[PDB]
UniProtKB/Swiss-Prot annotation, chain A:
Domain of life of the native organism: Eukaryota
Protein name (record): V-type proton ATPase 116 kDa subunit a 1
Localisation per UniProt entry: Cytoplasmic vesicle, Clathrin-coated vesicle membrane; Cytoplasmic vesicle, Secretory vesicle, Synaptic vesicle membrane; Melanosome
Subunit description: V-ATPase is a heteromultimeric enzyme made up of two complexes: the ATP-hydrolytic V1 complex and the proton translocation V0 complex. The V1 complex consists of three catalytic AB heterodimers that form a heterohexamer, three peripheral stalks each consisting of EG heterodimers, one central rotor including subunits D and F, and the regulatory subunits C and H. The proton translocation complex V0 consists of the proton transport subunit a, a ring of proteolipid subunits c9c'', rotary subunit d, subunits e and f, and the accessory subunits ATP6AP1/Ac45 and ATP6AP2/PRR. Interacts with SPAAR.
Signal peptide location: none
Residue ranges the record marks as coiled coil: none
Cited function: Subunit of the V0 complex of vacuolar(H+)-ATPase (V-ATPase), a multisubunit enzyme composed of a peripheral complex (V1) that hydrolyzes ATP and a membrane integral complex (V0) that translocates protons. V-ATPase is responsible for the acidification of various organelles, such as lysosomes, endosomes, the trans-Golgi network, and secretory granules, including synaptic vesicles. In certain cell types, can be exported to the plasma membrane, where it is involved in the acidification of the extracellular environment. Required for assembly and activity of the vacuolar ATPase.
Originating organism: Rattus norvegicus
Residues of the full protein shown: 170 to 247 of 838
Family: Belongs to the V-ATPase 116 kDa subunit family.
Curated annotation (Swiss-Prot), chain B:
Cellular localisation: Cytoplasmic vesicle, Secretory vesicle, Synaptic vesicle membrane; Cytoplasmic vesicle, Clathrin-coated vesicle membrane
Protein name per UniProt: V-type proton ATPase subunit C 1
Described function: Subunit of the V1 complex of vacuolar(H+)-ATPase (V-ATPase), a multisubunit enzyme composed of a peripheral complex (V1) that hydrolyzes ATP and a membrane integral complex (V0) that translocates protons. V-ATPase is responsible for acidifying and maintaining the pH of intracellular compartments and in some cell types, is targeted to the plasma membrane, where it is responsible for acidifying the extracellular environment. Subunit C is necessary for the assembly of the catalytic sector of the enzyme and is likely to have a specific function in its catalytic activity.
Coiled-coil intervals, chain numbering: none
Species of the source: Rattus norvegicus (Rat)
Family per record: Belongs to the V-ATPase C subunit family.
Stretch of the intact protein here: 2 to 164 of 382
Transmembrane feature ranges: none
Positions carrying N-acetylthreonine: 1
Tissue specificity comment: Expressed in brain (at protein level).
Subunit structure comment from the entry: V-ATPase is a heteromultimeric enzyme made up of two complexes: the ATP-hydrolytic V1 complex and the proton translocation V0 complex. The V1 complex consists of three catalytic AB heterodimers that form a heterohexamer, three peripheral stalks each consisting of EG heterodimers, one central rotor including subunits D and F, and the regulatory subunits C and H. The proton translocation complex V0 consists of the proton transport subunit a, a ring of proteolipid subunits c9c'', rotary subunit d, subunits e and f, and the accessory subunits ATP6AP1/Ac45 and ATP6AP2/PRR.
Swiss-Prot record, chain E:
Name of this chain's protein: V-type proton ATPase subunit E 1
The organism's place on the tree of life at top rank: Eukaryota
Entry-annotated residues carrying Phosphotyrosine: 54
Family: Belongs to the V-ATPase E subunit family.
Subunit and interaction comment: V-ATPase is a heteromultimeric enzyme made up of two complexes: the ATP-hydrolytic V1 complex and the proton translocation V0 complex. The V1 complex consists of three catalytic AB heterodimers that form a heterohexamer, three peripheral stalks each consisting of EG heterodimers, one central rotor including subunits D and F, and the regulatory subunits C and H. The proton translocation complex V0 consists of the proton transport subunit a, a ring of proteolipid subunits c9c'', rotary subunit d, subunits e and f, and the accessory subunits ATP6AP1/Ac45 and ATP6AP2/PRR.
Location of the protein in the cell: Apical cell membrane; Cytoplasmic vesicle, Secretory vesicle, Synaptic vesicle membrane; Cytoplasmic vesicle, Clathrin-coated vesicle membrane
Residues of the full protein shown: 3 to 57 of 226
Functional description taken from the UniProt entry: Subunit of the V1 complex of vacuolar(H+)-ATPase (V-ATPase), a multisubunit enzyme composed of a peripheral complex (V1) that hydrolyzes ATP and a membrane integral complex (V0) that translocates protons. V-ATPase is responsible for acidifying and maintaining the pH of intracellular compartments and in some cell types, is targeted to the plasma membrane, where it is responsible for acidifying the extracellular environment.
Free-text tissue specificity from the UniProt record: Expressed in brain (at protein level).
């Protein structure tokens, strides 16, 4: 399906912050990247996995936009 | 007296006893005082409105808390039913918060329970804003009289060089 | 169990879509009925005015 | 002359302001409880008057009471319940 | 987190969406009935007066 891209250094905390702003409201979908290649920034190959959430509300889209900007993640396209 | 305002899922009616009755989970083994809030049955339309409300209420809550402090400090200067050593907490409808919380309800007098959250939050906000401005006016008038009075008392005070 | 949650919420969203489309449909239906009844009253008014016309003439 | 009525008015308005403080935060806790748990809206909400030096035990008891029922997802940010401090 | 926790989160996701949907539809039908009467009255009065003037 779709495998989003995150750095996943501290995803346990990304997830928690996401629940702090609203806990338990939407499903977090997980995907993983097999045999990732050199990080565009880090310059190395690390495993990557991502949790992607579709929201109906605008307030949560803006919330998680700010969160993902603060978090080490690339969740830019719809 | 400080209080903690806490809410549990409340899925079971046993929660009240779980919260209050059963020592293993009751607050401080049922020694601490724990009273239920009487809150009217209100609805949240959407999640987006829920979040907006969350932020707006946090802002409004801090606003009103500040106003309460401002008016209490004003009266403290007045020294009428509050002082620095005693009567720091304000009374609710003329009784203490402990009494008020004992009989706590959401007050239809401040906002109808049939109002949407937006409208309710707005009515309260308007109320407090108005209260703050009324205080600003009365406090200005009192501080003005207080200073001018002292200035006149001082004018006829002092040593023979300046009195 | 992810695919089930995905399916379930999509089902909720679908029903929601059906719900609003149908509410809008009822609105449309009521508006047409409103027009039909309005015209009926107008025609009733017409007959009345025509009769008074005939009476006066 | 102004003082008399001044302070009588203020005392009344401040009580009303305090009640409003109570109402508005009860709503705050209402909507947060809804946001935290979802529907229906029947939650177990308590006003706690701590005992001296009981805050440790209080945290312990409330933690065990609710933490095991919800999730690790939820202090200043993550608390098993809705919790606001009433400064009085 | 557990599968049961995931199921509870899914139920919560359903629940808010359904509530929003129910409220919006209700709002829509109430206004629809209002619009029914408003448009009806406007139309009726608009043409009734013209008929009157003719008469």
């Amino acid at each position: 399906f779709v495998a989003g891209v995150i750095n996943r250094e501290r995803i346990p905390t990304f997830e928690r912050m996401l629940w702090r702003v609203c806990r338990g409201n939407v499903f977090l979908r997980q995907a993983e990247i097999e045999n990732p290649l050199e990080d565009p920034v880090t310059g190395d190959y690390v495993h990557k996995s991502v949790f992607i959430i579709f929201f109906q509300g605008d307030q949560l889209k803006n919330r998680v936009k700010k969160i993902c900007e603060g978090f080490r993640a690339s969740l830019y396209p719809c | 007296t400080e209080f903690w305002l806490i809410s549990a899922p409340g899925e079971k009616t046993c929660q009240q006893t779980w919260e209050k009755l059963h020592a293993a989970t009751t607050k401080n083994n049922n020694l601490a005082v724990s009273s239920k809030f009487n809150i009217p049955d209100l609805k949240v339309g959407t999640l987006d409105v829920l979040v907006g409300l969350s932020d707006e209420l946090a802002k409004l809550d801090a606003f009103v808390e500040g106003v309460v402090k401002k008016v209490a400090q004003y009266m403290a200067d007045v020294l009428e039913d509050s002082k620095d050593k005693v009567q720091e907490n304000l009374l609710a409808s003329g009784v203490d918060l402990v009494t008020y919380i004992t009989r706590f309800q959401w007050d239809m007098a401040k906002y109808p329970i049939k109002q949407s959250l937006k409208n309710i939050s707005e009515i309260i906000a308007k109320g407090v804003t108005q209260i703050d401005n009324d205080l600003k006016s009365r406090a200005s008038a009192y501080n003005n009289l207080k200073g001018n009075l002292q200035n006149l008392e001082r004018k006829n005070a002092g040593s023979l060089l300046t009195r | 169990s992810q695919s089930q949650g995905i399916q379930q919420l999509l089902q909720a969203e679908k029903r929601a879509a059906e719900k609003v489309a149908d509410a809008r449909k009822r609105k449309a239906r009521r508006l047409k009925q409103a027009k039909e009844e309005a015209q009926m009253e107008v025609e009733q008014y017409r007959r009345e005015r025509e009769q008074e016309f005939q009476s006066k003439q | 002359k102004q003082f008399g009525p001044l302070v009588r008015w203020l005392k009344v308005n401040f009580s009303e302001a305090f009640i409003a403080w109570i109402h508005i935060k009860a709503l705050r806790v209402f909507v947060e409880s809804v946001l935290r748990y979802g529907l229906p809206v029947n939650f177990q909400a308590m006003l706690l008057q701590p005992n001296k030096k009981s805050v440790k035990k209080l945290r312990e008891v409330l933690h065990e009471l609710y933490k095991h029922l919800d999730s690790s997802a939820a202090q200043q940010e993550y608390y098993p319940y809705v919790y606001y401090k009433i400064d009085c | 987190l557990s599968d049961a926790d995931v199921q509870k989160q899914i139920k919560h996701m359903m629940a808010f969406i359904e509530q929003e949907a129910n409220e919006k539809a209700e709002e829509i039908d109430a206004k629809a009935e209002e619009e029914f009467n408003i448009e009806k009255g406007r139309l009726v009065q608009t043409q009734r007066l013209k008929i009157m003037e003719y008469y």
